[PDB]
Amino acid sequence: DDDM
Amino acid sequence: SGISLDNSYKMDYPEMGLCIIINNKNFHKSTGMTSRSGTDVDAANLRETFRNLKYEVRNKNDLTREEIVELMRDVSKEDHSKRSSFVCVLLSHGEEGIIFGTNGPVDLKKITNFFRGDRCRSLTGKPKLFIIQACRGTELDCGIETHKIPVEADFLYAYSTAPGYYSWRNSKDGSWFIQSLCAMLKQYADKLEFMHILTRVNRKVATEFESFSFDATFHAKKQIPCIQSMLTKELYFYH
Amino acid sequence: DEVD
């Protein structure tokens, strides 16, 4: 899970 | 076979492991904490740096104290059987023993405890690296002109600053420590053991940075990072 | 330069  | 030596962590599992990056820039007004400009520069630097070391990087931005704890709990509950190591980078406000979520403090010990040898079995005997860019107090450095293992074993805490001290961040270039960490990892990760890399980081921060401020209290100050190693072997990022 |  990645925001960036 | 012939003579075998075992002074180095096994880093040839199928995966290098996870690199969790927690980047807190914007804080809830009620806390009274200011925004951490420059920290996005840091987070992207780390993402690229660790990507090149073959870590599965997860960037997380602006987490509450509850979200921080929940993330670490969930990550510590993954199966790390096929991974060589674990890395966690914390970028936030802090004080000694504490890192801030967007709405309040988190005890550093609460975070790392999730990964204790007895609570995260698939990381037992593997290196668990915590890289912490955050204040550890309010002191300023004026400088001077020139069959069982311990549950706390196999941790390395790479602090940006000495116990009790402020940590410095440049709003354009990023934090002094993370700037230097990434440069030294890029240049030496394929050559040097990690402790020796972190010593080069120490020298870089100590010699190449010095604060500039219109405020005399904060002008011309220095910084030395702090390596806290509970590792039991040498750590090389190659094999 | 800013402190954290």
Side-chain angles (χ1 to χ4, degrees):
Chain A
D1 183 75
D2 223 345
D3 294 341
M4 257 270 169
Chain B
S1 289
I3 305 169
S4 50
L5 298 181
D6 190 22
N7 305 297
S8 174
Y9 287 111
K10 175 182 170 64
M11 297 299 296
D12 66 338
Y13 286 89
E15 300 170 17
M16 286 290 287
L18 307 176
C19 171
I20 308 293
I21 302 178
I22 298 182
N23 184 33
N24 282 350
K25 176 174 75 185
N26 298 308
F27 297 81
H28 292 195
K29 54 191 187 312
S30 300
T31 67
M33 293 185 280
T34 66
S35 283
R36 293 182 60 264
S37 29
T39 192
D40 281 356
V41 176
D42 279 350
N45 205 1
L46 293 156
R47 180 180 174 82
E48 177 66 6
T49 297
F50 277 94
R51 178 185 79 82
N52 286 323
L53 297 171
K54 310 304 173 183
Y55 283 84
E56 175 185 336
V57 173
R58 307 190 183 154
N59 283 77
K60 289 302 284 180
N61 293 313
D62 284 344
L63 300 194
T64 61
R65 73 202 303 198
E66 294 82 13
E67 278 169 322
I68 292 185
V69 166
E70 177 203 27
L71 176 69
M72 297 297 100
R73 173 172 44 246
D74 295 349
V75 162
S76 80
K77 259 28 183 168
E78 290 179 33
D79 187 352
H80 298 264
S81 289
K82 313 291 182 51
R83 302 168 180 157
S84 302
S85 66
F86 175 74
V87 174
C88 174
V89 190
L90 306 165
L91 312 175
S92 195
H93 291 296
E95 65 191 8
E96 186 70 58
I98 287 169
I99 191 86
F100 280 88
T102 53
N103 62 336
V106 171
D107 275 15
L108 278 188
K109 285 297 294 194
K110 176 170 191 177
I111 291 169
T112 55
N113 279 347
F114 286 122
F115 304 88
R116 274 165 44 141
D118 58 343
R119 295 183 194 176
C120 185
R121 301 311 317 276
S122 55
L123 285 172
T124 304
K126 300 176 177 175
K128 302 163 266 289
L129 307 191
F130 292 87
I131 298 163
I132 307 156
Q133 166 56 44
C135 292
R136 303 179 78 185
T138 47
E139 288 181 63
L140 292 165
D141 193 317
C142 64
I144 183 60
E145 265 179 358
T146 42
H147 74 138
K148 296 201 301 187
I149 58 164
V151 303
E152 302 278 7
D154 303 312
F155 282 84
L156 179 290
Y157 306 79
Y159 292 94
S160 65
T161 199
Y165 285 81
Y166 279 118
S167 189
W168 285 94
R169 164 178 39 88
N170 184 277
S171 55
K172 166 173 72 184
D173 310 337
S175 84
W176 299 358
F177 175 62
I178 298 299
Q179 285 185 60
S180 305
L181 180 62
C182 293
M184 292 303 81
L185 278 176
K186 174 184 177 176
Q187 174 170 19
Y188 295 108
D190 60 323
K191 306 169 188 178
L192 291 181
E193 192 274 332
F194 190 37
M195 291 308 292
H196 287 172
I197 294 176
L198 285 177
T199 302
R200 306 289 191 103
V201 171
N202 279 4
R203 191 176 185 207
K204 207 167 202 292
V205 173
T207 61
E208 296 180 2
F209 301 78
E210 183 184 311
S211 66
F212 180 87
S213 179
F214 296 143
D215 184 337
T217 301
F218 294 87
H219 177 63
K221 304 298 178 197
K222 297 290 288 186
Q223 180 170 319
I224 182 78
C226 174
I227 308 161
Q228 186 178 292
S229 175
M230 270 104 302
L231 298 183
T232 60
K233 303 181 183 174
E234 291 162 24
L235 184 45
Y236 301 86
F237 291 112
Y238 61 89
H239 72 259
Chain C
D1 290 327
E2 296 180 1
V3 292
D4 244 347

